[PDB]
């Protein structure tokens, strides 16, 4: 219960699961430049109204 | 065994004092260098952190076809 | 980063065009030539940090 | 940043004239010996990659590797020492010219300072 | 102390230039000579260290560890040359190179005089061990074992690097002597609490603490015999050495901080000693034994009394020797029967008598029989804990009972009863194996003859 | 007989030569820390009329 | 392609980079970037196929948009101060525009999307060029104007780059995409220390370039573009795989290897400031890069994968053209940590 | 700042957004790029004309030259894409997805 | 922008739980709206209504998380008479994590979010008290 299940679950298995989920989310892109440049526009708009306003 | 392989305690004692002096000097020098870096970056009056400005040798001091320059 | 080849060789590849107070053809002056020369002279040699204040 | 702009500095010198007033690194300097070791390792890896007897294939090219690494390392060490000497010179001059920012505090003995005692129990 | 460091770097090319059938002989002979040379570090002073140069120094805490490392290399060479018989000469030289590099990094680690160099070598030890485990292991779990071993260590040790550079930026130095002489109390702050955690957690992971101890059974079970020997004997003691060194700066913060770690160490002492009672795998049983003993060492280091530190040093040395011997004994049976299940080969005392008495003496030293150094260290820690709190004796007492229980259970299961009928390939013990067992066990008794050599600087 | 046995067992001198070199390097290292030789408040001693250094 | 034309194009790329580095005028730096892009586009398309055309098109579009933003930032700076010299960047809006333009030229997150696709679509030589030489000019410009750089934006993009490189690299089987994601993470490490000390940025740049050159040259020596094609190399070139494994460990950042030195210096420089949390997160995130480097090392050197029968014929032939400096790059990429203080010759 | 400067900067922003948003044909994106060049040229010329800087009168010429270089580069790439697929649709440029 | 964070921080820790909850839900709504924008940009929803549905879902989840966090932290601070203590922020963070787990309808997500959000909020409070800087200004 403690070694083979819960101590495994908390530190290493949770870490592996979270990193795998984030890797799947980040990497799996459609490959289309339309979506990429839409993201670029969103990023530019955010930078201008956030970091820039507070000089 | 002591004569063939080892030395007296004076040698280790005085080597320890020499080493301690070197390390203490290095520590105070590191702290002083950090303080000097902070001061020069804050003020800009030191040799360090001197960002370039425009050279005044580029200015043309000649009559400019208009008296008011 | 910045390799100052011009300063080393004394070449003037692009410095002629950087400021308004620098040898325009036919001695035609910029609109703010006097202000720019005053700023450059005051600014010169003290470094960027000191210069702003 | 900090050392990029300094008064009286030639752009691409790599070794200013004022650096010759410093003691040159000895030819038996341990850092030079490590550079020669790096050259020997490069020669051995060159032999192994090209499928040649690693220790004995090319002696002239291994010698060239070792001497090239030592040759570059000597000037690298000279420039390293020069820049560290400049750092110390500038720091000492700045300390001397700004006395109010680096004041010598009063010397206290451990018989006078009261340090709190934390028992271990 | 380059008179020890340079002969190992010379072991390297001597191995790489030896002819194909003389590598083991040359390595063993010259490693034994190097250990004989390193034995001269035991002439320690009583008030300060042996400050050799600006970068290396030695006191009576690191000298026994250095001697243990230099002595352990020839034992690993002897144990390795059986399962590498079919191996090509180049990869045999590569294996010996891995062992030599591990020794060199360990030797420089125990004597590095400032914290950053110690950290660099402390983590450099990870590469040869990982290569050994994941290249010369036998089963398919060696890859995952190596991954666990690497990442558990690095996750706890990177914050140590951040804390070390912060400490040097604040105080100006990290040389141990300057750190000790210029030490100042830590305030009760959240920043100080997290700096304490960053300084302590790497060594907790290395010990290992009961919680973060999972990497250890995987690493020690999947590793080849020399890898297991070096992991159990020396590599676990890096955390103890690091704590005994880094703790001077931490106080007085340790008093209210050490509570969760003390509780984890004691209850996990009980838990991991209970686990050994139901272990069907021999190597896992020895690994969990190591976990419980190192939990005892963690308690000793945390409570920070002179008797605690003496007991911790004695226990570290004794456990290194005992665990190495136990792993070698298990590996002999493994090479006999090609399985690690405890109940497969039974009644081995009938067929291997001298190996049976080696098993008996190893089990006796494991359960801390007097007047072995194992019990000297354990009893010093127990007395220190009783001074810390009189209720610790219950937990300490329970642990002693379970330790004797599983040690004698392992001995009875493997050695006594009747031999399994089907196995007929149990050959008589070789001279190499008996010599290896003797070279583990004789130093333990010779050390209990003169116990002040492994009692640390507080002696 | 000497030639082949030497070419076979020249590797057995690397570790002893390494130890000798390490001893020499230790001597060279500790002759650089003489800034307090015969200057300690605890061991400051009058030099005998024939020697020149209290320790090497 | 004709060798003369290829040499001319490579020298035009290099001359554009040098023009960016040696110019004191904003217009000349812009011209250097444009010349670099103009000569760089055909090199990606040297071996013609639909994938190379896709990579060239995506790279061209991204770099052209970045050039647009860079010229707009220059013009706004000129409007608010009649200065053409690359300096403190007197206007903050122009500074934000310039920072995003240069970050998108570099591939820093959230502008990182183009890099994996372009690296995968081109050959290994063009990938080497793209991931080593094409980072110098934007980083030089960023170094020159680091005084006016905004810490909040630059550090955000650097942390995003480290996180995204680490995460995206975990999912990759192709080697070129792995190298691209590692490039993104290293770019983040480089730009995190930029507002504090540009010498550390240059040091990380040099170490990363050495390691990247070694890794691409090893992947070209053993003609492998996928994980399983590299799993075959041990049966033909075991020494190459061993050197690759040591180089991978160095790339991961484990001491006493060369790779550890740049992160060690950056962390020290950041902690000379207050800056405690961010280096901790950076190290814990570089753990991901180490993980997928170790996955590659497991597949290529520490285990032996099944081979094919036709490898026996390859056993009889030597590597025809040997790339020079491969041995030197490996040595500099592994055994250079003891020479760490020599970084003082960089400021 | 005058109001014509607002109009020119808004033109630049509109062209940048138009480039960022992709519909179908690649040609339209190149049109947006060339519009961004046009706006940059007009802004530079107005600033250069307003404060009498004589020596920068040539930089709009160089700007147009390198604008034409970008236009030629984009047209060559569009030719090759259309030859591969028969249309200049950006939806086809998705091979590097996997 | 950061004006939302000032309107959150200008309110004293243990006073006006309604205003603090409003500021917290504004911050949550802004974060969820940004996440929705990026998700729509990178992963199209195949129809306008499905896109607005995804945007509303993400924004509502984030706003509820923020509102619960702010309300719980303020109430805990004032009833216990112990401001300047990270335990209130930990309680608020676990409440927000439970809210997220309920929104996703999963017990495991709920427990993980409790633990991690509570730890993050406690660390943020400790950084506010001590003065830790996420983005330190260059000072050397
Ligand atoms: C800190 C202190 C110092 C340490 C520094 C670091 C280590 C030393 C320097 C390292 C670099 C130097 C050499 C590199 C190139 C060598 C490559 C090689 O393969 O060597 C083959 C070669 C033998 O081959 P051969 O004789 O030609 O014929 C057999 C075939 O070639 C056989 O060919 P093959 O095709 O059959 O080979 C196949 C094999 C071949 O695979 C390999 O051999 C591995 C190659 C090593 C990788 C090196 C990468 C760069 C170095 C980084 C080191 C990292 C150190 C940090 C710790 C982390 C460890 C990774 O691959 C495999 O089988 C797969 C095994 C997978 C294992 C994975 C682990 C590999 C990486 C471990 C590296 C650790 C360092 C090793 C150093 C020595 C290794 C030879 O080895 C040698 O003979 C050279 C050894 C050194 C010579 C010195 C002798 C000089 C004179 C002696 C006297 C000294 C002074 C005298 C004066 C005194 C007065 C009297
Ligand atoms: C004080 C500030 C407070 C904290 C702020 C900082 C923390 C922000 C937390 C946001 C975490 C990021 C990711 C969220 C979860 C993943 C996305 C998702 O699918 O969610 C669905 C997930 C469950 O839905 P599902 O259907 O099961 O998942 C679908 C599949 O699993 C798979 O779904 P998928 O495949 O459709 O994935 C979506 C898609 C799209 O990926 C995304 O969603 C992007 C999200 C990143 C935005 C980061 C937000 C930070 C905003 C800071 C400023 C706030 C202003 C105020 O993924 C991708 O395509 C690739 C992603 C990676 C590529 C690069 C994207 C990075 C862009 C750059 C990041 C931001 C740049 C900022 C400026 C840059 C200029 C230098 O969770 C949700 O329901 C959404 C709610 C998320 C929780 C938000 C927590 C807010 C707490 C606020 C409390 C305030 C209290 C008072 C404070 C004092
Ligand atoms: C100097 C530096 C500054 C430079 C930058 C300056 C920029 C400003 C000037 C720009 C002037 C515009 C002039 C021309 C623009 C060119 C447009 C174009 O070429 O269209 C191509 C593009 C491609 O279309 P297509 O390929 O030909 O047709 C196929 C279908 O479109 C697609 O096929 P499908 O039907 O199968 O797909 C499903 C459906 C899916 O449809 C959807 O999913 C969209 C539904 C999203 C719901 C929006 C949220 C609703 C509630 C929010 C409430 C806000 C706060 C209230 C309180 C909280 C409430 C809880 O369609 C979509 O996927 C479209 C999604 C993309 C939406 C538009 C992207 C804009 C940015 C991303 C916004 C994301 C919204 C999330 C929330 C954002 C924050 C509020 O057209 C579109 O994307 C459709 C809409 C275009 C019309 C409007 C364009 C104007 C937007 C300009 C910037 C936005 C405002 C900036 C103002 C800044 C202040 C000054
Ligand atoms: C370092 C050394 C070693 C340490 C490591 C080992 C120990 C730590 C790790 C192990 C425990 C941690 C695991 C976390 C929870 C895992 C849940 C999970 O994985 O979700 C997926 C999993 C399955 O996924 P699913 O498909 O979504 O659910 C389908 C179900 O199978 C279908 O289920 P159903 O339909 O049949 O019924 C579901 C429903 C119905 O519930 C049930 O079915 C049965 C009732 C279960 C929970 C209700 C409590 C009743 C018993 C407690 C009585 C007092 C206990 C003693 C405390 C006083 C001490 C004197 O559940 C509920 O509604 C329960 C709501 C939660 C209320 C409980 C509040 C407890 C707070 C703690 C207070 C005390 C703290 C200690 C202080 C001591 C100071 C001296 O969910 C579950 O089945 C578990 C739900 C029940 C929660 C159990 C957690 C309570 C244990 C204490 C946790 C505190 C430890 C960590 C602190 C931080 C946590 C916030
Ligand atoms: C793994 C290590 C990678 C090393 C990369 C290649 C190693 C060889 C380097 C090639 C040597 C030739 C380069 C220059 C020689 C003459 C040109 C001379 O003018 O350079 C001057 C000075 O020389 C160079 O600047 C320094 C080159 C030294 C490179 C070695 C340092 C490596 C970092 C530490 C790792 C240890 C490496 C040990 C050896 C392998 C430039 O001065 P300056 O115009 O004012 O600089 C402008 C840019 N600044 C101010 C921002 C810096
Ligand atoms: C699997 C094994 C893992 C290893 C386990 C390591 C354990 C590390 C725990 C460290 C123990 C001490 C940390 C906190 C110090 C004080 C304890 C806490 O209760 O503080 C109280 C304060 O009350 C509240 O508890 C404050 C803290 C609230 C936030 C903490 C909740 C964290 C939840 C536990 C998560 C589990 C840890 C593992 C994470 C992965 C004390 O009141 P006060 O005297 O005024 O403050 C003293 C500190 N001062 C002086 C600097 C201010
Ligand atoms: C901010 C973010 C911080 C990021 C922290 C990263 C910690 C470093 C560990 C990274 C491990 C990532 C593992 C992973 O993502 O993959 C899961 C992996 C997928 O298998 P593959 O080999 O990729 O596929 C083969 C089958 N087709 O699953 C596994 O098998 C896991 C095996 C090794 C896991 C090792 C994890 C050990 C974790 C120890 C604790 C340290 C965690 C770091 C943070 C410390 C906690 C605060
Ligand atoms: C096998 C897995 C083990 C993983 C353990 C790793 C975590 C170790 C514990 C925390 C490590 C990070 C500590 C940060 C480095 C210490 C430096 C320091 O203490 O200096 C403090 C800085 O203190 C901090 O900033 C600490 C910030 C912590 C952020 C990192 C979050 C890590 C996770 C936190 C909770 C988990 C830690 C314990 C988990 C134990 C393992 C289970 C003072 O700096 P100033 O800003 O100048 O403040 C005083 C001047 N006004």
């Amino acid at each position: 219960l403690l070694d083979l299940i819960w101590l495994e679950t908390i530190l290493p298995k949770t870490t592996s699961f979270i990193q795998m989920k984030m890797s799947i989310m980040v990497s799996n892109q459609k490959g289309l430049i339309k979506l990429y440049f839409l993201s670029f526009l969103i990023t530019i708009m955010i930078s201008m109204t956030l970091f820039n306003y507070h000089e | 065994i002591a004569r063939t392989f080892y030395d007296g305690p004076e040698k280790n004692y005085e080597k320890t004092m020499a080493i301690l002096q070197i390390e203490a000097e290095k520590a105070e020098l590191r702290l002083k260098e950090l303080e000097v870096r902070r001061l020069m970056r804050a003020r800009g009056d030191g040799p360090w952190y001197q960002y370039p400005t425009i050279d005044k040798a580029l200015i043309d001091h000649s009559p400019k076809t208009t008296p008011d320059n | 980063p910045f390799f100052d080849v011009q300063k080393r060789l004394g070449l003037d590849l692009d410095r002629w065009m950087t400021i308004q107070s620098a040898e325009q053809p036919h001695k035609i002056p910029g609109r703010c030539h006097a202000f720019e020369k005053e700023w450059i002279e005051c600014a010169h040699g003290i470094g960027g940090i000191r210069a702003e204040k | 940043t900090m050392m990029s702009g300094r008064p009286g500095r030639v752009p691409l010198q790599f070794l200013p004239n004022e650096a010759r007033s410093l003691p040159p690194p000895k030819l038996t300097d341990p850092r030079l010996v490590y550079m020669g070791f790096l050259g020997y390792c490069s020669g051995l890896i060159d032999n192994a990659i090209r499928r040649r007897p690693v220790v004995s294939a090319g002696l002239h090219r291994q010698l060239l590797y070792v001497t090239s690494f030592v040759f570059f390392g000597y000037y690298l060490l000279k420039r390293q020492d020069y820049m560290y000497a400049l750092r110390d010179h500038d720091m000492f001059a700045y300390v001397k010219s700004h006395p109010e920012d680096f004041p010598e505090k009063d010397k206290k003995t451990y018989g006078e300072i009261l340090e709190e005692f934390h028992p271990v129990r | 102390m380059l008179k020890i460091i340079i002969p190992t770097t010379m072991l390297l090319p001597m191995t790489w230039m030896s002819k194909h059938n003389m590598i083991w002989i040359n390595a063993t002979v010259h490693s034994l000579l190097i250990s004989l040379i390193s034995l001269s570090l035991l002439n320690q002073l009583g008030e300060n260290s042996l400050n050799f140069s600006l970068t290396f120094f030695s006191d009576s805490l690191s000298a026994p560890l250095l001697v243990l490392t230099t002595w352990l290399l020839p034992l690993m060479l002897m144990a390795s040359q059986s399962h590498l018989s079919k191996e090509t000469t180049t990869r045999k030289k590569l294996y010996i190179t891995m062992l030599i590099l591990l020794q060199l990094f360990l030797i420089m680690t125990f004597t590095a005089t400032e914290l950053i160099l110690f950290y660099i070598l402390f983590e450099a030890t990870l590469v040869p061990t990982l290569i050994i485990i994941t290249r010369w292991g036998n089963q398919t779990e060696r890859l995952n074992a190596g991954l666990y071993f690497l990442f558990y260590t690095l996750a706890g040790s990177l914050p140590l690097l951040v804390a070390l550079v912060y400490i040097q930026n604040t105080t100006g130095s990290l040389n141990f002597l300057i750190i000790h002489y210029w030490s100042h109390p830590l305030s009760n702050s959240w920043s100080n609490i997290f700096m304490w955690l960053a300084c302590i957690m790497a060594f907790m992971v290395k010990m290992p603490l009961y919680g973060l101890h999972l990497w250890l059974p995987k690493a020690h079970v999947e590793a080849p015999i020399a890898g297991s020997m070096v992991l159990a004997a020396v590599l676990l003691k890096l955390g103890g050495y690091g704590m005994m060194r880094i703790t001077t700066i931490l106080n007085p913060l340790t008093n209210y901080m050490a509570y969760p770690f003390l509780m984890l160490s004691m209850w996990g002492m009980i838990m991991t000693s209970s686990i050994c009672l139901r272990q069907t795998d021999l190597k896992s049983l020895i690994a969990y034994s190591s976990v419980s003993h190192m939990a005892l060492v963690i308690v000793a280091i945390m409570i920070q009394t002179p008797w605690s530190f003496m007991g911790a040093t004695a226990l570290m040395i004794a456990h290194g020797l005992t665990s190495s011997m136990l792993f070698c004994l298990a590996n002999t049976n493994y090479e006999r029967v090609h399985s690690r299940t405890m109940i497969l080969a039974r009644g081995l005392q009938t067929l291997l008598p001298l190996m049976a008495t080696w098993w008996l003496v190893a089990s006796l030293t494991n359960l801390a029989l007097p007047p072995s150094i194992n019990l000297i260290g354990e009893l010093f820690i127990i007395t220190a804990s009783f001074s810390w709190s009189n209720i610790t004796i219950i937990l300490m007492g329970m642990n002693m009972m379970i330790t004797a229980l599983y040690s004698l259970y392992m001995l009875i299961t493997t050695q006594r009863g009747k031999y399994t009928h089907h196995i007929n390939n149990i050959k008589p013990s070789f001279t190499r194996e008996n010599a290896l067992m003797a070279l583990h066990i004789l130093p333990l008794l010779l050390l209990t003859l003169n116990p002040k050599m492994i009692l640390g600087p507080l002696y | 007989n000497v030639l082949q046995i030497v070419r076979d067992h020249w590797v057995h001198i690397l570790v002893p030569v390494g130890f000798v070199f390490g001893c020499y390097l230790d001597r060279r290292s500790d002759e650089k820390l003489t800034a307090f030789r015969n200057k300690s408040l605890l061991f400051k001693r009058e030099l005998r009329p024939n020697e020149e250094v209290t320790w090497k | 392609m004709n060798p003369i034309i290829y040499t001319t194009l490579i020298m035009t790329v290099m001359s554009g980079t040098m023009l960016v580095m040696i110019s004191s005028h904003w217009l000349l730096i812009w011209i250097g970037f444009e010349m670099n892009l103009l000569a760089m586009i055909p090199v990606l398309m040297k071996n013609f196929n639909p994938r190379a055309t896709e990579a060239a098109t995506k790279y061209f579009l991204t770099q052209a948009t970045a050039s647009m933003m860079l010229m707009m930032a220059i013009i706004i700076n000129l409007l608010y101060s009649g200065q053409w010299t690359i300096t403190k960047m007197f206007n903050p809006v122009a500074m934000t525009m310039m920072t995003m333009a240069l970050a998108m030229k570099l591939g820093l997150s959230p502008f990182h999307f183009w890099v994996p696709e372009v690296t995968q679509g081109i050959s290994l030589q063009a990938g080497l060029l793209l991931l080593t030489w094409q980072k110098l000019a934007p980083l030089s410009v960023l170094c020159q104007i680091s005084q006016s750089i905004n810490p909040n934006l630059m550090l955000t993009m650097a942390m995003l780059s480290i996180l995204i490189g680490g995460w995206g690299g975990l999912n990759q089987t192709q080697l070129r995409k792995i190298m691209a994601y590692s490039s993104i993470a290293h770019m983040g490490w480089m730009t995190a220390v930029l507002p504090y000390n540009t010498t550390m940025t240059i040091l990380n740049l040099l170490i990363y370039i050495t390691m990247t050159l070694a890794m691409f040259m090893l992947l070209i020596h053993s003609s492998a573009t996928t994980t399983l094609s590299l799993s075959h190399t041990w049966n033909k070139m075991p020494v190459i795989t061993s050197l690759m494994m040591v180089t991978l460990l160095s790339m991961g950042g484990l001491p006493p290897l060369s790779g550890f030195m740049p992160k060690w210096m950056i962390i020290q420089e950041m902690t000379k400031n207050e800056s405690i949390i961010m280096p901790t997160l950076m190290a814990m995130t570089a753990l991901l890069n180490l993980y997928f480097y170790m996955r590659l090392a497991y597949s290529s050197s520490l285990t032996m994968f099944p081979s094919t029968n036709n490898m026996k014929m390859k056993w009889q032939f030597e590597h025809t053209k040997q790339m020079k400096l491969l041995p030197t790059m490996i040595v500099l990429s592994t055994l250079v940590l003891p020479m760490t203080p020599a970084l003082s010759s960089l400021n | 700042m005058p109001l014509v400067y607002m109009n020119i900067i808004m033109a630049f922003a509109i062209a940048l957004a138009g480039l960022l948003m992709y519909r179908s044909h690649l040609m339209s994106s190149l049109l947006c790029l060339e519009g961004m060049m046009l706006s940059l040229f007009i802004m530079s010329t107005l600033i250069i004309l307003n404060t009498h800087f004589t020596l920068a009168n040539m930089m709009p010429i160089i700007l147009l030259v390198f604008a034409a270089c970008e236009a030629a580069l984009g047209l060559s790439l569009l030719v090759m894409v259309s030859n591969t697929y028969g249309t200049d649709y950006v939806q086809n440029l998705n091979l590097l997805q996997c | 922008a950061k004006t939302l964070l000032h309107k959150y921080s200008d309110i004293p820790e243990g006073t006006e739980c309604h205003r603090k909850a409003y500021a917290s839900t504004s911050i949550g709504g802004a974060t969820g709206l940004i996440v929705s924008a990026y998700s729509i940009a990178l992963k199209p929803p195949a129809s306008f209504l499905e896109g607005v549905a995804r945007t509303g879902r993400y924004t509502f989840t984030s706003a509820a998380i923020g509102a619960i966090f702010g309300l719980t932290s303020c109430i805990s601070a004032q009833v216990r008479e112990k401001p300047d203590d990270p335990l209130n922020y930990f309680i608020g963070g676990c409440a927000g994590g439970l809210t997220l787990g309920a929104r996703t309808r999963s017990y495991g997500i709920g427990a993980a979010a409790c633990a991690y959000m509570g730890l993050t909020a406690a660390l943020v409070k400790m950084g506010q008290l001590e003065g830790w800087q996420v983005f330190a200004e260059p000072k050397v």
Side-chain angles (χ1 to χ4, degrees), chain E residues 109-347:
Chain E
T109 311
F110 291 128
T111 54
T113 195
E114 62 87 20
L115 267 169
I116 301 299
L117 179 67
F118 162 75
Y119 172 92
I120 288 183
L121 301 152
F122 172 96
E123 285 196 320
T125 50
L126 262 68
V127 191
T129 311
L130 175 62
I131 289 165
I132 283 163
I133 295 173
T134 55
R135 173 74 198 199
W136 283 280
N138 290 318
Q139 288 177 6
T140 185
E141 293 83 3
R142 63 193 195 253
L143 301 191
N144 189 359
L147 284 190
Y148 266 53
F149 166 71
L150 172 72
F151 285 106
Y152 267 85
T153 303
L154 279 177
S157 81
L158 291 156
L160 175 68
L161 176 62
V162 178
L164 285 187
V165 300
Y166 169 82
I167 285 160
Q168 184 177 2
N169 292 335
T170 287
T171 66
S173 172
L174 279 177
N175 194 275
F176 284 112
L177 303 164
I178 288 310
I179 295 278
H180 169 265
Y181 280 94
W182 285 7
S183 62
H184 65 279
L186 282 180
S187 168
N188 187 9
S189 304
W190 286 117
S191 304
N192 283 339
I193 277 169
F194 282 107
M195 183 278 288
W196 194 98
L197 279 164
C199 289
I200 279 291
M201 277 314 264
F203 308 119
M204 294 296 172
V205 174
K206 272 266 182 186
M207 281 297 279
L209 180 60
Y210 166 81
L212 326 166
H213 78 276
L214 292 198
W215 67 270
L216 189 139
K218 309 208 184 222
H220 294 195
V221 161
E222 305 319 298
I225 181 54
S228 292
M229 293 177 70
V230 75
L231 282 158
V234 177
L235 299 183
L236 290 181
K237 318 306 161 62
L238 283 175
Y241 181 78
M243 293 180 183
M244 293 177 71
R245 290 294 188 195
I246 213 162
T247 34
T248 169
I249 72 168
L250 307 182
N251 221 62
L253 187 58
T254 301
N255 302 196
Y256 111 92
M257 279 296 295
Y259 271 97
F261 298 90
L262 281 179
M263 294 307 93
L264 270 172
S265 294
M266 293 173 138
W267 188 241
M269 185 180 289
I270 299 307
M271 290 311 257
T272 51
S273 191
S274 295
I275 288 162
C276 293
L277 291 161
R278 296 295 301 276
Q279 274 304 310
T280 67
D281 197 348
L282 196 41
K283 290 196 82 169
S284 313
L285 195 145
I286 307 162
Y288 281 110
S289 311
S290 314
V291 179
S292 64
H293 291 294
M294 295 299 291
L296 200 49
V297 179
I298 295 170
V299 172
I301 292 172
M302 282 300 100
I303 58 188
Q304 293 179 356
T305 72
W307 281 68
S308 288
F309 274 31
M310 294 182 286
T313 312
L315 198 41
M316 281 190 294
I317 301 299
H319 164 271
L321 272 169
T322 298
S323 52
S324 192
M325 196 185 177
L326 281 176
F327 273 123
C328 293
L329 279 164
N331 186 69
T332 54
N333 287 342
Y334 177 79
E335 293 179 353
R336 292 302 200 284
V337 307
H338 305 301
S339 177
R340 292 189 296 272
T341 308
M342 185 180 288
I343 62 170
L344 179 79
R346 287 168 272 103

Side-chain angles (χ1 to χ4, degrees), chain E residues 1-3 6 10 19 26, chain F residues 8 11-12 14 18-19 26:
Chain E
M1 68 165 318
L2 300 171
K3 59 181 63 73
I6 292 174
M10 273 294 99
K19 67 182 291 294
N26 300 349
Chain F
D8 210 327
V11 301
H12 291 105
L14 296 184
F19 162 73
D26 284 332

